[PDB]
Design a protein around this ligand. Structure first.
Ligand code: 1YC
Ligand code: ZN
Length: 360
């Protein structure tokens, strides 16, 4: 693929500051309004907007946003559920002292369902026109911890609750984050000396669910390594060190989004998220630690590489969580072979025909 073609697509993706600010004002207003009322309850007293920039993950739909609320939970003990390596139960260490979240305690185990119930409840109470904006709450999609709300029948904002743990990272993440040769073991060291988050998501057990398990979240680390991607510290700070990592990620994400949009009727792509793309991209970054391997004039090649790798995952049904190596994202239990074969077919067609889906 021509670097000028792909860079033409990326040039098109770049939107004006007005379209990204006009909405961000109202969204920021609603969020800042909710944050105040969240502190009225003793449970959500230690809550706070996790500084991620208050931006979205989509590229072109920018009408949607994504915010994440962190909540510090001191002295927590995780319990690995059914050896899923990624889902845990929350058991507080010392309970003779009064605990704010005791109302959600299902014994020794913290109930995620009641937590999200109270959270979504308070939010649903504040959404009853208290502001000057017209905001309505969307239905629960099922299993989804996010609480989406709609402003002016145009802007969608998903609110997610997290559990901040300043303790040491779980043992499942021991062999994770293989950035030693890429961003140095020093950066890995200092990064692993950061808190890890927890999101209320139930894992699959077959003909049922738990609704009381929590998944490991490392979105902040992803943002960090994303905004600081080069092996060189001055990467993308001068004309001689401009790379194309971010460009590749944007291209992959946009490809997946366009394919998911084109086949919205069918359900073959509904089990694929941009996170699989991001993960695959991180794996490629590990496989290509040198900035020279990411020259901006090689955008075509680099991108192709990513595509190839992604395809390989789909072809092998293997996509390890970048932080939890044993946790496979493309396992047969999660996503079926049919969907992955479909996506391989579509993507392969796109690559073989100069990506006509970009011009849609
Ligand atoms: N707005 C919003 N929606 C989410 C989020 N995480 C999941 N969802 C959606 O809620 C359902 C939960 O599905 P699973 O978590 O069990 O696995 C989902 C699902 O298989 C796919 C996401 O598909 P989506 O269309 O975006 O909808 C999901 C899904 O309907 O990737 C998985 N996934 C998404 N984010 C991650 C992630 N960060 N780590 C591991 N797996 C992830 C989220 O963080 N924000
Ligand atoms: Zn760079």
């Amino acid at each position: 693929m021509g670097a000028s073609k792909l860079r033409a697509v990326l040039e098109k993706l770049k939107l004006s500051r007005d379209d990204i600010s006009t909405a961000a004002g109202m969204v920021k207003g609603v969020v800042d309004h909710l944050l105040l009322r969240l502190k009225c309850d003793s449970a959500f007293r230690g809550v706070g907007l996790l500084n991620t920039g208050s931006y979205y993950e989509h590229v072109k739909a920018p009408n949607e946003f994504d915010v994440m609320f962190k909540l510090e939970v001191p002295r927590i003990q995780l319990e690995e559920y059914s050896n899923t390596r990624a889902y845990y139960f929350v058991k507080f260490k010392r309970n003779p002292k009064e605990n704010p979240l005791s109302q959600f305690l299902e014994g020794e185990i913290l109930s995620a369902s009641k937590m999200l119930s109270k959270f979504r409840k308070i939010i649903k109470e504040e959404i009853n026109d208290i502001k000057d904006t017209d905001v309505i709450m969307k239905r629960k999609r099922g299993g989804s911890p996010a609480v989406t709300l709609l402003i002016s029948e145009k802007i969608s904002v998903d609110i997610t609750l997290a559990l901040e743990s300043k303790s040491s990272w779980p043992a499942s993440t021991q062999e994770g984050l293989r950035i030693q040769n890429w961003l140095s073991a020093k950066v890995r060291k200092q990064l692993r000396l950061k808190p890890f988050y927890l999101v209320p998501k139930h894992a699959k057990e077959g003909n049922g669910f738990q609704e009381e398990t929590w998944r490991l979240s490392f979105s902040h680390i992803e943002k960090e390594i994303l905004n600081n991607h080069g092996k060189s510290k001055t990467c993308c700070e001068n004309k001689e060190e401009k790379c194309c990592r971010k460009d590749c990620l944007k291209l992959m994400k946009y490809l997946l989004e366009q394919l998911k949009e084109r086949f919205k009727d069918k359900k073959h792509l509904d089990k694929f998220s941009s996170y699989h793309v991001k993960t695959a991209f991180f794996h490629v970054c590990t496989q290509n630690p040198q900035d020279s391997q990411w020259d901006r004039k090689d955008l075509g090649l680099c991108f192709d590489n990513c595509v190839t790798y992604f395809l390989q995952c789909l072809r092998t049904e293997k996509l390890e969580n970048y932080f939890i190596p044993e946790f496979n994202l493309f396992s047969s239990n999660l996503i079926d072979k049919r969907s992955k074969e479909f996506l391989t077919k579509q993507i392969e067609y796109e690559r073989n025909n100069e990506f006509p889906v970009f011009d849609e």
